[PDB]
Ligand binder design. Structure first.
Ligand SMILES: C[C@H](CCCC(C)(C)O)[C@H]1CC[C@H]2[C@@H]3[C@H](O)C=C4C[C@@H](O)CC[C@]4(C)[C@H]3CC[C@]12C
Lengths: 227, 59, 284, 339, 232
């Protein structure tokens, strides 16, 4: 009838069972959230991982409100970024940790460059990347508690010589957030959520959950065609 | 210091790479062309085989 | 004289129907090419949208033969009566099942990714196609003899129509209407619930566009399909309460009403690609 | 100073090497292959389409029997196919879904993989339990492991993104030789047919011919203008073609020590991801970023054909040891076997 | 790898029983399993088959309707439930592991078998002789003739050579007429074509004495042979 021998039919049975297992595993994987965790060196990524109840890629799993998140920290991967970022093309969100006080600090051997300029250079390189044309970004301006002391001591004229505001935390934070979000060149295809954190801020996971729920519903409305 | 050893390694590597007997491009190209010619009869992608010998067309 | 208004009809009807045909052609071939060019989208909603635009394209090809009897002639009419009357209703079920898809994609997305695959989508497409096939088949095996080819009075006889046309209108319009309203009401309710819950959804306002598009689809479907079917059901219930018949004024006004509302029931095909272009954001 | 002295010595040596290379180019390959008849047109049709992956397929490798395939995808899955009947013989779940390479052993017993975790996993296929266990996990690289090739059932040659390649003994798990000398990220390997030499191309516009026995960089070839993403040896082991990120393949020669041929087309500006010769070496198949694979007449630099059946960027290619078929993996989660 | 059967003993004719094959030491959920019985003297006869999951279930026509196979994957257990036994079912029953893919080695492991005593078209395969005398050190040749051409169209011939040592379960020796099984010394070789097959053994040992069976895997029911015996 089908000209297949007995072993051929049994091999096709094995193939179909493998297909079933692949489909079930893919369905299990598609219901998880994948967050790529980026940022400059010593921006407070490890602080964020400690806050959220948790060599090569450091992959951290955690559940919250019946939603499983997998956070991929790639700061340990010291190679050409443009050679492996394209494998993170299908993540749902890019968490981006930026230190706030770091506007008045320099890390690397290059002592002339203020490291906030390097941080927002990295932000501009990631946000406007051709692989992340529609992958939403979740900013995390860390250590806002230590930012106030540096505001009292040293204004934004060091990092931003074009500073117009006063030496108050609210105006400075708003200006920094505006400067960051204006680096987006894809404002229609991609949203940028911003949140000010600290060491004791336990509302971080709540903000991540809200932003991820927004991105998932927007993706579903895009697949429906409604959006 | 540190860079002196790296420069020494690079110079020794280039010393090892400078002393190689290179044949003319004529002879190497002729060998490549002769290999491509002598095995043309045994290339299924180059010379298409009948559908009876193709194990992918038997359905 | 049930065709006394042939003086004004030969003015209004052909210009309008030709406008319908040209707008449908230009807005549907463009939609088809921007769908097949975007070959990355291979989900079930893509399949239903393709089936819908193919059905409406076939209707636009079906229109220039039916436009013949609008000015003052073989049995070919009957065959045309097939390719006309399937396509619009071939639209309807699609406009239903697609909506179901959208509902099951937004509220219960896990079951959407589980059971609502490409395989089940193709299966239910073939199911819908054969379901409309079997229902429109008896129209092919009926002659439409004379002076006017597509004459519903020559078609109609009180033997079996008054109870099969009500059921046909029911299964064609009333159940799809209820399904569309249920699905889109659930979608809107879930979007409102999310807007109440998440602050970032209320801030960014991603759901307002979806709300506008949903209310637009609902109002265009209702305004397009309601008058024809409510005229049919109203005439059936009037036949019930008025058992006899007068072809001077009552049936004449019924003919004018039906010939009027079929304009909108086919005009749906003009607004449908505009719905597709308004719904999707970046392809317009 | 001593630093400037050594640098001037190195520059004099580079000038001597360039002068010796120019002293051998008495003719060009396009001048010797002028009277040979052209290949003609090559229309190859998709014979098989292997579905089952749910994400980008990043690498593949034919078995030595020209029938079985291994294909690794960032679904997290390494599937072993029977290419004659499209049956999935095996499906192996990886511990880290960020795989970028795979290799099928030349005996058929083992299968390697690795990726953005700096660890090469050796899976055993033929066990008494019918299962597929992790026979070994070779660790020691400090960058992403870009390519991987079985030298034998006991020795393997890896190349990672920390500017180095290594030769592992699988039975113990230690680097018996570390090939260093590159300055950019190493992206591809290609063992010689006589399995005593191998070439590696970096993100430095440089390929290097290493001797696998001693561990010394025998020769260094430059000429590209961007990163090198794929290398394959010519079937006799005396030439190799490198595909680069500047939309250019280049055929280099080992004995002549020079670049022989440049395969480029003005309508092509997309980077190359995969290179593989045919069985006779007359065809050079190159997978591009513009969603198709071009088939070049390797002796005339003409473009003999196009394979344009994919929807996304074309990842690793493969030509069977029989030369019967050409398998093409891509980012749209489908393999396509052409003939 | 271990398969242990249990549930034998003495049964009255017309009764019922349930044989249980407990598996230990392999991925039981992925192996097709067979029940193969052997009469007190008559040689092996295939009984029943259960697939990798719980797919196709085949039965020998002589036991269709009376027997049924259950399979518990989470407990690694096979079940042959027998109803209305006859005096033809008194036999030793072997649980047989077999996995099917490209290049696989089916029928490779046989359980120890349990004894069930009961109180009081088809590819027939013929082995030429019932017994041939041997001396340790000389090459021998065993023949097996099929009734139908075992050479399938896809290139494979589907004949299997098994050896049963005295008082043990028969192990696999050759699968698909050429391929040795893993763990078999390279003294045995298989050859032949169509409906004529030969197993040629090199220098014999005291462990090569036994009974050699041939089987065909084209279509169910899988029909064993008579069983050529060797004597020292
Ligand atoms: C052709 C006639 C008279 C109309 C005369 C004019 C000139 C207006 O066309 C119209 C009148 C009512 C129509 C049906 C009605 O819509 C219910 C559906 C169910 C659906 O599944 C399949 C199509 C079907 C049966 C319609 C077929 C055709 C019908 C009979």
């Amino acid at each position: 009838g089908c000209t297949l021998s007995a072993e051929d039919k049994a091999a096709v049975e094995r193939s179909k069972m493998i297909d079933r297992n692949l489909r079930e595993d893919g369905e299990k994987a598609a219901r998880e959230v994948k967050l790529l965790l980026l940022g400059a060196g010593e921006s407070g990524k490890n602080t964020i991982v400690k806050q959220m109840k948790i060599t090569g890629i450091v992959e951290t799993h955690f559940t919250f409100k019946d939603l499983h998140f997998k956070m991929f920290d790639v700061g340990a991967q010291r190679s050409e970024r443009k050679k492996w970022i394209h494998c993170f093309e299908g993540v749902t969100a890019i968490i981006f940790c930026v230190a706030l006080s770091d506007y008045d600090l320099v890390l690397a051997e290059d002592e002339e460059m203020n490291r906030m300029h390097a941080s927002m250079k990295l932000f501009d390189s990631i946000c406007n990347n051709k692989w992340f044309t529609d992958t939403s970004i979740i900013l995390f301006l860390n250590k806002k508690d230590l930012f106030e002391e540096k505001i009292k001591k040293s204004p934004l004229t060091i990092c931003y010589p074009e500073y117009a505001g006063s030496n108050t935390y609210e105006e400075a934070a708003a200006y920094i957030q505006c400067q960051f979000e204006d680096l987006n060149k894809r404002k229609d295809t991609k949203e940028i959520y911003t949140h000010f954190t600290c060491a004791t801020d336990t509302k971080n996971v709540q903000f991540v959950f809200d932003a991820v729920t927004d991105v998932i519903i927007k993706n579903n409305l895009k697949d429906c065609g409604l959006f | 210091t540190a860079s002196i050893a790296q420069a020494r390694k690079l110079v020794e590597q280039l010393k090892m790479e400078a002393n190689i007997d290179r044949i003319k491009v004529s002879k190497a190209a002729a060998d490549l062309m002769a290999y491509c010619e002598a095995h043309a009869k045994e290339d299924p992608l180059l010379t298409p085989v009948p559908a009876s010998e193709n194990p992918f067309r038997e359905k | 004289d049930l065709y006394a208004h042939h003086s004004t009809a030969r003015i209004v009807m052909p210009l309008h129907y030709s406008l319908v045909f040209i707008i449908g052609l230009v807005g549907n071939l463009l939609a088809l090419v921007v769908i097949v060019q975007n070959r990355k989208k291979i989900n079930s909603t893509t399949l239903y949208s393709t089936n819908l635009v193919i059905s409406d394209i076939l209707f636009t090809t079906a229109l220039p033969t039916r436009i013949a009897y609008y000015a003052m002639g073989d049995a070919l009419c009957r065959i045309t009566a097939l390719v006309f009357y399937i396509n619009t209703y071939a639209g309807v079920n699609f406009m239903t099942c697609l909506s179901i898809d959208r509902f099951i994609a937004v509220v219960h997305p896990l079951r959407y990714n589980k059971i609502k695959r490409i395989e089940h989508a193709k299966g239910v497409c073939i199911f819908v196609w054969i379901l409309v096939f079997a229902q429109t088949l008896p129209l092919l095996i009926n002659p439409m003899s004379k002076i006017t080819c597509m004459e519903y009075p020559n078609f109609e006889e009180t033997k079996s129509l008054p109870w099969i046309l009500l059921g046909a209108c029911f299964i064609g319009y009333v159940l799809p209407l209820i399904i569309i309203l249920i699905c889109y009401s659930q979608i809107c309710c879930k979007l409102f619930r999310t807007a109440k819950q998440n602050p970032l959804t209320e801030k960014s306002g991603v759901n307002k566009k979806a709300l506008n598009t949903i209310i637009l689809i609902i109002v265009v479907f209702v305004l397009c399909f309601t008058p024809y079917h409510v005229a049919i059901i109203q005439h059936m219930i009037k036949k019930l309460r008025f058992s006899n018949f007068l072809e001077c004024s009552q049936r004449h006004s019924f003919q004018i009403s039906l010939h009027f509302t079929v304009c909108l029931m086919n005009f749906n095909c003009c607004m449908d690609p505009f719905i597709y272009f308004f719904a999707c954001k970046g392809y317009k | 100073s001593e630093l400037d002295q050594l640098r001037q010595e190195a520059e004099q040596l580079k000038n001597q090497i360039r002068d010796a290379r120019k002293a051998c180019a008495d003719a060009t390959l396009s001048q010797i292959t002028n009277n040979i008849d052209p290949v003609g047109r090559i229309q190859m049709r998709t014979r098989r389409t292997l579905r089952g992956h749910l994400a980008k397929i990043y690498a593949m490798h034919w078995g030595t029997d020209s029938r079985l395939l291994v294909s690794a995808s960032q679904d997290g899955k390494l599937i072993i196919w029977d290419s004659y009947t499209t049956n999935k013989v095996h499906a192996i779940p990886l511990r880290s879904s960020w795989v970028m390479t795979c290799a099928y052993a030349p005996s058929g017993n083992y299968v390697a993989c690795g990726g953005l975790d700096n660890i090469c996993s050796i899976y055993n296929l033929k066990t008494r339990e019918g299962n597929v266990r992790v026979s070994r996990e070779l660790a020691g690289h400090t960058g992403y492991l870009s390519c991987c090739r079985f030298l034998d059932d006991n020795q393997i040659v890896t190349s990672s993104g920390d500017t180095t390649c290594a030769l592992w003994d699988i039975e113990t798990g230690q680097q018996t030789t570390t090939f260093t000398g590159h300055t950019g990220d190493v992206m591809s390997l290609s063992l010689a047919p006589d399995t005593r030499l191998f070439v590696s191309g970096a993100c430095d516009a440089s390929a290097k011919l290493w001797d696998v026995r001693e561990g010394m960089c025998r020769q260094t070839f430059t000429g590209h203008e961007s990163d090198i993403n794929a290398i394959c040896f010519f079937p006799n082991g005396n030439a190799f073609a490198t595909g680069s990120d500047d939309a250019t393949c280049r055929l280099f020669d080992l004995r002549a020590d020079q670049e022989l041929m440049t395969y480029s087309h003005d309508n092509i500006i997309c980077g190359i991801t995969s290179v593989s010769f045919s069985k006779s070496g007359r065809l050079l198949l190159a997978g591009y970023d513009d969603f198709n694979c071009n088939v070049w007449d390797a002796l005339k630099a003409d473009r003999a054909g196009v394979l344009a059946g994919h929807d996304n960027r074309v990842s690793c290619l493969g030509v069977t040891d029989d030369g019967m078929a050409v398998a093409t993996g891509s980012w749209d989660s489908f393999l396509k076997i052409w003939n | 790898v271990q398969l242990v059967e249990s549930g034998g003993g003495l049964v009255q004719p017309g009764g019922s029983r349930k044989l249980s094959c407990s598996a230990s030491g392999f991925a039981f959920s992925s192996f097709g399993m067979h029940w193969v019985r052997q009469a007190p003297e008559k040689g092996l006869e295939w009984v029943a088959y259960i697939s990798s999951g719980s797919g196709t279930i085949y039965y020998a026509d002589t036991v269709k309707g009376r027997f049924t196979i259950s399979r518990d994957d989470p407990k690694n257990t096979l079940f042959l439930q027998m109803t209305s036994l006859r005096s033809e079912d008194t036999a030793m029953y072997y649980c047989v592991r077999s996995i099917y893919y490209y290049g696989s080695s089916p029928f490779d492991f046989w359980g120890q078998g349990t004894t069930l005593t009961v109180s009081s078209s088809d590819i027939v395969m013929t082995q030429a002789t019932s017994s041939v005398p041997v001396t340790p050190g000389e090459s021998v040749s065993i023949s097996c003739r099929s009734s139908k051409s075992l050479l399938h169209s896809n290139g494979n011939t589907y004949l299997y050579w098994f050896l049963q040592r005295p008082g043990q379960s028969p192990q696999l020796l050759i699968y698909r007429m050429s391929n040795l099984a893993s763990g078999v010394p390279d003294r045995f070789s298989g050859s032949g074509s169509g409906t004529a097959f030969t197993l040629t053994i090199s220098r014999l040992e005291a462990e090569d004495v036994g009974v050699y069976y041939c089987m065909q895997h084209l279509e169910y029911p899988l029909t064993f042979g008579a069983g050529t015996k060797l004597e020292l």
